[PDB]
């Protein structure tokens, strides 16, 4: 869980970030609230334009799924009723997969969730709470649950998991499970053991994120 | 290949196989698609060729483009699962069908509105161990059923028939013609085709009315 992030790296965007876990590096940018296109307009709430760009080649249907899952996480996080008939552009440029993209998209999704959240924080957009996402995997010979697995570990995995939780009260109370994307062969006992260990490492991540956010933003503010 | 679909590997090549008058019966169903305003299922089986096509009517709905005293109608044919036709040929039939139902649909009752009619050529099997001409009368039957099922006003039950590559659609008990189509065929066979098609037109119209009423 030795992640590293930077905040406010882009000039022509309201907010930006660069999240790095292992070899997975994703840069994200957020502009909003701004004027929306007519087809995007929502009478009462904020409209989200979510874009995911791959590390190699052009955006395909694969990234279209990454956009969809990332939408399921960011939508309830943002206090959308504060910005009626308005738009918020959220762009993720995956710079380095950190995994075999022909087989997995686990680490890229988690890194996009964490980066998007950080970019939303930087942009100063109304959020109902905080959030953290981690990738998890299981190995058949080992029987182990490995949090933040490497690319080599994924190759020999039986199941891959993306867990993103919603935290409140100083990152101590799990408000809800924003996203759990479990793929592969697994049983009910493995699922809850995954959720128990997953919640712990997620809570540790929020604490680390809270540290990063305060370290970067506080110099900008005044005492 | 395509960034919007999964078409598989490019080095892959499709599987190619090797070698080692007649009465017509049809089945009719309407209103089985909750997604739209009107829909119809038309299935026909005869000799060495069966056809199962589905029609769907969406309208009257809003038109962005222009003001209109009367309604606007669009027809699009889509290729089905296995049998395939040229896009040009499907466009041509669409145009031919537009002309027909612009003579039947009471457009005056739908100002600034759009009636979009879709016909899915779902299953067209060719069992012979321009074929599009034999599908045309079944399309008109489906669109007529779908429009009537949608509640769109029609001057008369438009039906048609096919005989030796010649297709002609009738209204008003076969007194008048709302469309004439002819590919291939023979010479000076107009009178024979008109009679044979009117017989099919009459049979289709009876089954259509029977379907719109009893069902």
């Amino acid at each position: 869980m030795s992640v590293q992030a930077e905040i406010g790296i882009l000039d022509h965007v309201d907010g930006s970030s660069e999240f790095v876990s292992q070899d997975t590096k994703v840069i994200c940018s957020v502009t909003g609230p701004i004027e929306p296109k007519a087809r995007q307009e929502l009478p009462t709430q904020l409209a989200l334009e979510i874009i995911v760009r791959p590390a190699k080649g052009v955006a395909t249907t694969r990234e279209k799924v990454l956009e969809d899952k990332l939408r399921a996480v960011l939508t309830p996080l943002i206090t959308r009723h504060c910005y009626p008939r308005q738009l918020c552009q959220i762009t993720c440029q995956i710079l380095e997969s950190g995994e075999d993209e022909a087989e997995f998209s686990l680490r890229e999704l988690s890194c996009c969730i964490n980066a998007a959240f950080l970019a939303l924080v930087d942009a100063g957009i109304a959020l109902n709470s905080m959030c953290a996402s981690i990738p998890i995997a299981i190995i058949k010979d080992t029987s182990d649950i490995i949090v933040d697995p490497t690319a080599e570990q994924l190759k020999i995995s039986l199941s891959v998991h993306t867990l993103a939780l919603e935290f409140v009260n100083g990152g101590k109370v799990v408000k809800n499970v924003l996203l759990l994307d479990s793929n592969g062969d697994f049983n009910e006992d493995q699922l809850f053991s995954l959720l128990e260990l997953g919640e712990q490492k997620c809570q540790e991540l929020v604490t680390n994120i809270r540290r990063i956010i305060q370290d970067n933003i506080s110099p900008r503010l005044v005492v | 290949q395509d960034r919007r679909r999964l078409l598989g590997p490019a080095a892959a090549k499709p599987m190619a196989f090797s070698n080692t008058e007649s009465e017509q019966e049809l089945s009719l169903h309407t209103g089985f698609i909750e997604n739209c305003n009107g829909s119809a299922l038309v299935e026909a089986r005869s000799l060495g060729h069966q056809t199962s096509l589905i029609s769907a009517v969406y309208g009257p709905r809003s038109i962005r483009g222009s003001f209109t005293s009367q309604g606007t109608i669009s027809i699009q044919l889509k290729n089905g699962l296995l049998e395939k036709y040229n896009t040009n040929e499907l466009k041509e039939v669409s145009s031919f069908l537009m002309g027909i139902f612009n003579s039947v649909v009471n457009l005056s009752r739908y100002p600034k509105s759009g009636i979009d009619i879709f016909v899915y050529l779902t299953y067209d099997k060719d069992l012979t161990n321009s074929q599009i001409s034999s599908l045309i009368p079944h399309c008109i039957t489906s669109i007529t059923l779908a429009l009537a099922d949608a509640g769109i006003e029609l001057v008369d039950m438009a039906g048609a028939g096919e005989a030796n590559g010649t297709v002609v659609s009738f209204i008003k008990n076969g007194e008048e013609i709302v469309g004439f189509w002819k590919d291939d065929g023979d010479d000076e066979d107009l009178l024979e085709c008109l009679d044979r098609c009117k017989e099919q037109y009459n049979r289709y119209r009876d089954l259509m009315i029977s379907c719109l009423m009893n069902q």
Partner: peptide, 28 residues
């Protein structure tokens, strides 16, 4: 073994009809 590198898949094209004409929706 039971690793993912030894398994294939089908390539599906799903089309949903809703009375519109144009490019593939995000749903499809």
């Amino acid at each position: 073994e039971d690793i993912i590198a030894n398994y294939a898949s089908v390539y599906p094209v799903v089309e949903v009809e809703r009375g519109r004409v144009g490019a593939c929706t995000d749903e499809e």
